[PDB]
Amino acid sequence: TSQVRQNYHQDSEAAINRQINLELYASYVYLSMSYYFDRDDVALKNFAKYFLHQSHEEREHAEKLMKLQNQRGGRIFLQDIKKPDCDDWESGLNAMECALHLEKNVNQSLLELHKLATDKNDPHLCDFIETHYLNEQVKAIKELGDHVTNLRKMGAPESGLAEYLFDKHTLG
Amino acid sequence: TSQVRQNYHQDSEAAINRQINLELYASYVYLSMSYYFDRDDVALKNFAKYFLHQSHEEREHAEKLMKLQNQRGGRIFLQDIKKPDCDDWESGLNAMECALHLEKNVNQSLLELHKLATDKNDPHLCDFIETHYLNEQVKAIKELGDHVTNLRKMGAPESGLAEYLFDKHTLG
Amino acid sequence: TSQVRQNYHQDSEAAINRQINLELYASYVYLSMSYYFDRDDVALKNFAKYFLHQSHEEREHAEKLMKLQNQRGGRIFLQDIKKPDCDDWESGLNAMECALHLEKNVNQSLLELHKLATDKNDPHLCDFIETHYLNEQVKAIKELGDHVTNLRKMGAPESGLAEYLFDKHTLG
Amino acid sequence: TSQVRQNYHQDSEAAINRQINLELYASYVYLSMSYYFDRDDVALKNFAKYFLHQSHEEREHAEKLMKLQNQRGGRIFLQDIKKPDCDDWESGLNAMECALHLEKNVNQSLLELHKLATDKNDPHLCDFIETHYLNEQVKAIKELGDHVTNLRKMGAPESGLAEYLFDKHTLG
Ligand SMILES: [Cl-]
Ligand SMILES: [Cl-]
Ligand SMILES: [Cl-]
Ligand SMILES: [Cl-]
Ligand SMILES: [Cl-]
Ligand SMILES: [Cl-]
Ligand SMILES: [Cl-]
Ligand SMILES: [Cl-]
Ligand SMILES: [Cl-]
Ligand SMILES: [Cl-]
Ligand SMILES: [Cl-]
Ligand SMILES: [Cl-]
Ligand SMILES: [Cl-]
Ligand SMILES: [Mg+2]
Ligand SMILES: [Mg+2]
Ligand SMILES: [Mg+2]
Ligand SMILES: [Mg+2]
Ligand SMILES: [Mg+2]
Ligand SMILES: [Mg+2]
Ligand SMILES: [Mg+2]
Ligand SMILES: [Mg+2]
Ligand SMILES: [Mg+2]
Ligand SMILES: [Mg+2]
């Protein structure tokens, strides 16, 4: 047993490894979305900037969980990072809707993680999830919801003018 | 023979003189496009600014090739600079499409130049073309493609509002 | 066909997508190595810092290739990022030897890419690989070779003192 | 009853007084360790500095719990501060191992405190423990584990050179 390990259930250790993989998957989804908007036939540079920033944020989320695993004396086990569900994201609105779905899936995984930590009476892990992940997810979901609303109200996806002006005024 | 000349084929010398003329022609096309958007019945000042900048860039491309000709001991021979294909460029979108076609023609000429330099085993000339011209062309073509895409998506040429807002937000 | 595409062979496009995946795989190997040295039973913080920096560099390599794909009018196709070959990297010396092997595999892939670009007469892609990748690989391989040499000469892996002092004096 | 007291169980009040005593005891252990390394026949000044800093930290932990007791309207009751288990700490490695054991005992006490606060439905006290104590303990335990690992790998306690160089390079 690790000399540092204390009050850290094997199920929690495994769930943290699963969450590391999910955060890396989310980084990959956002990377794919970013370079879709960099295509010469899409050409929305601030959508590309926004999703690249989100991608780098998710990698930071993954690294913090790797740090946590070692802090608690668990052992990191990595799995393949699956490619994103889509290659062509269709429109700025469709990408925003996909990101909203992704962030609500990641949130559900974090809530399941917190339920496990609660069931195993691990208050340090509960506080870690609350402090560093749960409100970040609530803010991300709210921001993406706001973006989806505005794009819909402006007339996207059919209005290429709507996505152009949203790119300039909200994401610029 | 020039006291500096070494490994510089006569065919390469001639091809450089042809490329000087083509760069000056491209400068002239962009100058014509610029002042079209300065007409009181067109009146898109940032299209005019953008194409004037492109025009001055092409003159710099031509001057660098003149410098290269003398560096290698070839002799500059100048020809008439032909007037651009059009007097009236119709719309911001049409001018962007014409510039895209121009830059892909200039790129093809540079690729033919590089093939000649390769066939004559002139690595200095190959490196000159690669370093100073080929990625500049790839960037220019990509930028013009992006501009054409956005103008189309926004509803140009029919939407005078589209070209107005592109002038402000992308070229401003 | 993409409006920007010119002199870009379909085989080159596919080879760039394969190289994107390889750079992301290398990012993942170095991420795994980094957090191995963050374990409480390994505890070499400057090895961990060094490999995390290398990991972020590889992600930058991947992003630049994604940018290139779009610059040339190819289409990015992503694949799963395979997990690294190992979970436990055994020692600082063993991790350095694995990184040396990785970088020489990545170099071989880049050389095959350059041979393809040469065979398809794509001087822009040749210059891209030369400018942004080939000397970076030669420098990386030389640095890792130097590190392996010093660790061996100092008495690693058996000497925990050797790896400790290398961590402080070379990687600190 | 105190005019401020609300939702503060008598068992929680007593457990906080016990935790005050434990934090003061930990301050005393680290003070003793510090001046052991100040002996002329031990003479490891950075071990002495490190443990004196830890000692002052524990006194700050105790004072914050005294503040909490009064914030919630409980009444501080102090007990004797027991002398540390040892007078001679033998070596830098042995002192680090003793500190690791101490911090894992203090953590266990804090986890028992949190379980009590949870059982008494005291979310303010739960949050206090999580915010100010539980991650501090996880970080302390991880740091001490790292230090023990390095000293072992370097050849301590038998190698006086190992402890000398650790004193300079890790604790300096
Ligand atoms: Cl367990
Ligand atoms: Cl519209
Ligand atoms: Cl559209
Ligand atoms: Cl000749
Ligand atoms: Cl309109
Ligand atoms: Cl109009
Ligand atoms: Cl082809
Ligand atoms: Cl030794
Ligand atoms: Cl060892
Ligand atoms: Cl030394
Ligand atoms: Cl009570
Ligand atoms: Cl010795
Ligand atoms: Cl000794
Ligand atoms: Mg995340
Ligand atoms: Mg699959
Ligand atoms: Mg030019
Ligand atoms: Mg004529
Ligand atoms: Mg690389
Ligand atoms: Mg596999
Ligand atoms: Mg070459
Ligand atoms: Mg304490
Ligand atoms: Mg006694
Ligand atoms: Mg709670």
UniProtKB/Swiss-Prot annotation, chains A, B, C, D:
Keywords of the record, alphabetical order, are: Acetylation, Cytoplasm, Cytoplasmic vesicle, Iron, Iron storage, Lysosome, Metal-binding, Neurodegeneration, Oxidoreductase, Phosphoprotein
Reaction(s) catalysed by this chain, per the record, are: 4 Fe(2+) + O2 + 4 H(+) = 4 Fe(3+) + 2 H2O
Task: Tell me which residues are marked as the site Essential for association with cargo receptor NCOA4.
Answer: R18
Q: Where does the record place it?
A: Cytoplasm; Lysosome; Cytoplasmic vesicle, Autophagosome
Q: What does the UniProt entry list as the effect of changing K82Q?
A: Reduces iron binding and oxidation rate. No effect on iron binding but the oxidation rate is severely reduced
Q: What is its main location?
A: cytoplasm
What are the residue boundaries of the Ferritin-like diiron domain, all occurrences included? 6-155
Protein origin, superkingdom:
Eukaryota
- Provide one Gene Ontology cellular component: extracellular exosome
* Alphabetical list of Gene3D superfamilies matching this protein: 1.20.1260.10
The record lists Fe cation 2 as bound by E58, E103, Q137
Is Chloroplast among the key words of this record?
no
Residues that, per the record, bind Fe cation 1:
E23, E58, H61
CDD domains the UniProt entry points to: Euk_Ferritin
Query: What broad class of enzyme is this?
Result: oxidoreductase
- Annotated tissue distribution: Expressed in the liver.
The record's Gene Ontology biological-process terms are: immune response; intracellular iron ion homeostasis; iron ion transport; negative regulation of cell population proliferation; negative regulation of ferroptosis; negative regulation of fibroblast proliferation
Q: What disease is this protein tied to?
A: Hemochromatosis 5: A disorder of iron metabolism characterized by iron overload. Excess iron is deposited in a variety of organs leading to their failure, and resulting in serious illnesses including cirrhosis, hepatomas, diabetes, cardiomyopathy, arthritis, and hypogonadotropic hypogonadism. Severe effects of the disease usually do not appear until after decades of progressive iron loading.
How this chain assembles, per its entry, is:
Oligomer of 24 subunits. There are two types of subunits: L (light) chain and H (heavy) chain. The major chain can be light or heavy, depending on the species and tissue type. In the human liver, the heavy chain is predominant. The functional molecule forms a roughly spherical shell with a diameter of 12 nm and contains a central cavity into which the insoluble mineral iron core is deposited. Interacts with NCOA4; NCOA4 promotes targeting of the iron-binding ferritin complex to autolysosomes following starvation or iron depletion.
What protein family does this chain belong to?
Belongs to the ferritin family.
Physiological role: Stores iron in a soluble, non-toxic, readily available form. Important for iron homeostasis. Has ferroxidase activity. Iron is taken up in the ferrous form and deposited as ferric hydroxides after oxidation. Also plays a role in delivery of iron to cells. Mediates iron uptake in capsule cells of the developing kidney. Delivery to lysosomes is mediated by the cargo receptor NCOA4 for autophagic degradation and release of iron.
Query: Could you identify this protein by its name?
Result: Ferritin heavy chain
Q: Which organism is it from?
A: Homo sapiens
